[PDB]
Amino acid sequence: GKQCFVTGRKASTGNRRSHALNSTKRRWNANLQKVRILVDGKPKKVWVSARALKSGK
Amino acid sequence: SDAVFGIEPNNSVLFEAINLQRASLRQGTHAVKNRSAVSGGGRKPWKQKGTGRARQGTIRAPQWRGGGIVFGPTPRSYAYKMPKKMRRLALRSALSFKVQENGLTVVDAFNFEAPKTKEFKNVLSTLEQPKKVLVVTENEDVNVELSARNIPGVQVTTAQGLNVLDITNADSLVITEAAAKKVEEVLG
Amino acid sequence: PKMKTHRGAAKRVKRTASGQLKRSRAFTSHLFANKSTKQKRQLRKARLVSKSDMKRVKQLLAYK
Amino acid sequence: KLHELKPAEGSRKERNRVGRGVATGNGKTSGRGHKGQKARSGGGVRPGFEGGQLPLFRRLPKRGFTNINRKEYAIVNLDQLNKFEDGTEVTPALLVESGVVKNEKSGIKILGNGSLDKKLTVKAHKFSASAAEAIDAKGGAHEV
RNA sequence: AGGCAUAAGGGAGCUUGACUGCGAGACCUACAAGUCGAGCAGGGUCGAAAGACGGACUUAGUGAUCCGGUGGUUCCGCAUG
RNA sequence: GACAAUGGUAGGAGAGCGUUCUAAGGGCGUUGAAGCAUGAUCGUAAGGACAUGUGGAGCGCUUAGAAGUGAGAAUGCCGGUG
RNA sequence: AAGCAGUAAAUGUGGAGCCGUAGCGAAAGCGAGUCUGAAUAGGGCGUUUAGUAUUUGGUCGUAGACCCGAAACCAGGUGAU
RNA sequence: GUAGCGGCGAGCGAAACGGGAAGAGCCCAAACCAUGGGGUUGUAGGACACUCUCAAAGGACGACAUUAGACGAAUCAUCUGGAAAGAUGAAUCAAAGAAGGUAAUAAUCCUGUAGUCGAAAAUGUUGUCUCUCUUGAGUGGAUCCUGAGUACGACGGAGCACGUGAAAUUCCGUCGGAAUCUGGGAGGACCAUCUCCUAAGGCUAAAUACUCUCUAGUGACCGAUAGUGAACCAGUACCGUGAGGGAAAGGUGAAAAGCACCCCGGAAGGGGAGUGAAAUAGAACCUGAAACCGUGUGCU
User: What ranges do the domains of chain A cover?
Assistant: First the structure.
């Protein structure tokens, strides 16, 4: 129930693989972090991904 | 002629044509429920061991009263085919058989203003015709189909619709002076 | 549905123009020091499948 | 005659219907013998491979590769041509029409399995070395 | 174990056939395998020569397939080189 | 005609009988169909007829075709009764 | 073949496609030959040339696959009267 | 069942070409103007210069269709009969010889069918009129736009027929990180030449899949242990705390004419008399097998 606020970055699921290729379901979380985005009305802290913090706030 | 009306009555092929003609005319809308389809089931009525009775899996096995049917009617089709040359050969045998006998009797194009079965039955009776006659006309006709298709045994049909089943069903043909050339031009 | 062919049999055999099979010899991968020259040179030719093999596997190869 | 219908003689049989008594022959064990794996419903060693000894087609080495750009042709001997006349410039589309060729796989290739005793002027993609000489013996110069 | 004193046992001189391409035919054998093999072509060693030589007197010293590695070459190399 | 053969499980081959439905043909049926019962009938077998009672409205025969096509065993299933 | 027309019909049309008339080789490739090979020297496979379409029967394959019968395993839920 | 993928095992398994059903394309961002105009793309298009004649969204507008219906040809008599449709004589209709019923087997007895006529009202689909709404082009080439944390790469995965493989073409996570028309991508590693296309925004009918429901109709489909579990007051008796499991059960006769009255009996049930063609058709009601249970006798 968590994603980016500037984009739609969500965790996903895939396999984890051994040396003998045994698979086991694991997940892939987005590098989500609280940040007071200074959006209209009020500085709101939300879960922005570390990818959407590179160039333009 | 003798390429169409003088050929041998090839019976090994005429029979296959008749059998095909009738097998292609079944529906096969008939089904039956197996173990999967019959309602209920899915519980073992008692223990595998320790009761005096026979070991039984579900109440809907074959032997149980009310069970599923093991094999049986499947919803399927019966139509098949054969080579085209054999089709034309059978449809020529079916007419050479009438020409061997006196089944065929040519006439001219009919004349009607509106459909009426009285004059049609009269004409059929004034031509010494047996009960079931096949009235083969050149094109589809309205003033003939209607005044013919109330009678017990009269089947009107066009050169576009000649059948190995229905030539041999009848024993008296009534073709026109125009449709016969149609069939000899078409048939090989 | 269509009968699937055995895809490992097709790599190992071809169809002569009579209805028999042109297989490839064995004992021809490694350990060539343990074989006579008359026996290495002999395994280099090809041979057919016997009758009994065609008994076992003849419809595994039915589209070849 | 739709009530006297005889099929050809030897063209229809009864199906064998096993499991209907000892007199037919296939009554009790229905042709399957006694106990085993080949007497169960659905029971049967799969074809070729079986579960035990090493099979044949997993014991013989693989051989060769297969080319993608194969490009094989439609063969024509000197006898498929004999159905023609003299003069008769021959086109690879024409030769498809007279009942000889039905598929230019990668062109037609004229082969020399026969003899002409004719005079045609053949055009095609690839020729033999016997076919070319057999054509040139009767004039009718060949060309690609 | 069967053979070997014509030696197949011992010694000496030269030498590399413990060669390349095969192979009518046969033995064995469920199959895969195994065994033998005259003769032909190419290149040679020993002998004056006729000839012999495709390891060892014979029968044990071995291990499919797939997979990976090294050498070579007429092959193929996904529009084209 | 003459001569030969004719025990048989697993198994192979062939020829048939019967049920249900379909097409065509040709029948029968309240002066009584199927069905049931009874018999001392006919065929090499599976089977078929006929007479007789009961029954009260549908059935066979010929040639083909199509099968949910044949029951004594499954501590079978359901019902009835010992 | 699909499709199109036609009584949910047979039929008509529809030659995309499939098999056969040519094989041999891993392939390039040659072709009544080809491949191996320095060499049809020999050898292997071929030149068998009658096949193809539909259908009856026998057998096999993918389907539950002659019928009945587990111990179990997994997913969703129901239960502390 | 090809290419190919595969402890190269068991198995998995394409696509383009070709033949067909159906078949239309459009709107944005940016450059440039004054939130509106402006503009859509690869034969490179647009802005700027020359002229030069689904695609917006609601409404009004008459013929068919669905939702009840109507007319609808033509037969009598004799025998058996309980009763005629049967049978025997003759007669007629038919664009109507579907089928159901009727005291037995009906083209002509009824309900119908062919065929034709019918719609206050409601809804549905198509026709034109209204209301809309729209300026379309053609050359040029200075310069200006043509989708950026994007494509792509690295590492870990998923998916493509393709198991990480020499894995091209795509998606995801985490990091690094481009070019801007001689630009960029693809043509199964990669490179160069050619050939094709123009990503990083979107919207699009038809051919196609299915059937809870409705309307006709079909069946070499069942016919009461069959067919739906359920032909019958069936998801019901019943069973379980619960989720849940789940049956059995049709047939008098043409018509109830369903047995007045008498007798035995407390009644139930009988025996008569009746009804009926038939009561051993009496509501447990078509036929009525076998098991089983009885009564009598011919031989023993």
Answer: 1-57
